[PDB]
Amino acid sequence: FSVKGPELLNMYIGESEANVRRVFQKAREAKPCVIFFDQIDSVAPKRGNQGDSGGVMDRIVSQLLAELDGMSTDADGVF
Amino acid sequence: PTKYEPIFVNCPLRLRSGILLYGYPGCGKTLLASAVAQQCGLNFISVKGPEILNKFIGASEQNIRELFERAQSVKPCILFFDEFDSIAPKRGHDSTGVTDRVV
Ligand SMILES: Nc1ncnc2c1ncn2[C@@H]1O[C@H](COP(=O)(O)OP(=O)(O)O)[C@@H](O)[C@H]1O
Numbered sequence: 001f002s003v004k005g006p007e008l009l010n011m012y013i014g015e016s017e018a019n020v021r022r023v024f025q026k027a028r029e030a031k032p033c034v035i036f037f038d039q040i041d042s043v044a045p046k047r048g049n050q051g052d053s054g055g056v057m058d059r060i061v062s063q064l065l066a067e068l069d070g071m072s073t074d075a076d077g078v079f
Numbered sequence: 080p081t082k083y084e085p086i087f088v089n090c091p092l093r094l095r096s097g098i099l100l101y102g103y104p105g106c107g108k109t110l111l112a113s114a115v116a117q118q119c120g121l122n123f124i125s126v127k128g129p130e131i132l133n134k135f136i137g138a139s140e141q142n143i144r145e146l147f148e149r150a151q152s153v154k155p156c157i158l159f160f161d162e163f164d165s166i167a168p169k170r171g172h173d174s175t176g177v178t179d180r181v182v
Contacts, residue, residue, distance in 0.1 A: 049134075050133075050134055
């Protein structure tokens with residue numbers, strides 16, 4: 001169950017964090033799951049402070065890296 | 080100053096409050112800050128210097144005020160600056176870059 005939709009970054013509401021959280025909750029559902037990242041535009045930060053004001057996307061990337069691997073559990077299975 | 084509360088009520092002079100720490104690169108600095116936060120007598124929030132140095136003129140300075148406006152709104156806080164070298168202006172006066180604005 002790959003992402004397949006990272007380009008759908010956000011609405012005008014700052015729901016992107018909730019969206020990515022739901023993505024990883026769907027990940028935790030069907031625990032043996034591997035998430036493929038298209039790695040296009042939701043991976044924006046080249047320098048972390050110069051691309052597109054570091055706005056919505058900077059929060060998205062911060063959340064993504066924060067939750068990417070919290071050493072949760074082996075049984076989690078999220079690759 | 081907090082534990083010995085009654086005496087410090089009599090203090091007629093502003094309490095020493097700021098401390099700075101050099102160190103050979105990364106010899107335990109954020110972890111120390113984290114622990115001194117977790118003593119929990121004070122709340123903690125922190126900024127990492129390269130995060131806020133936007134190219135945009137306004138945000139570059141507005142992001143500093145973003146911290147204080149929240150800190151003053153809650154409680155005594157640490158307001159730790161990591162990577163503070165990157166904010167510091169290297170005593171620059173001629174170029175008058177955005178760094179001068181921020182400092
Ligand atoms: N005395 C120590 N005890 C435990 N960990 C330490 C100690 N000294 C350094 N470290 C480790 O080094 C890092 C200290 O944080 P920091 O100095 O901010 O690293 P950096 O500057 O590279 O971000 C952490 O990864 C911490 O685990």
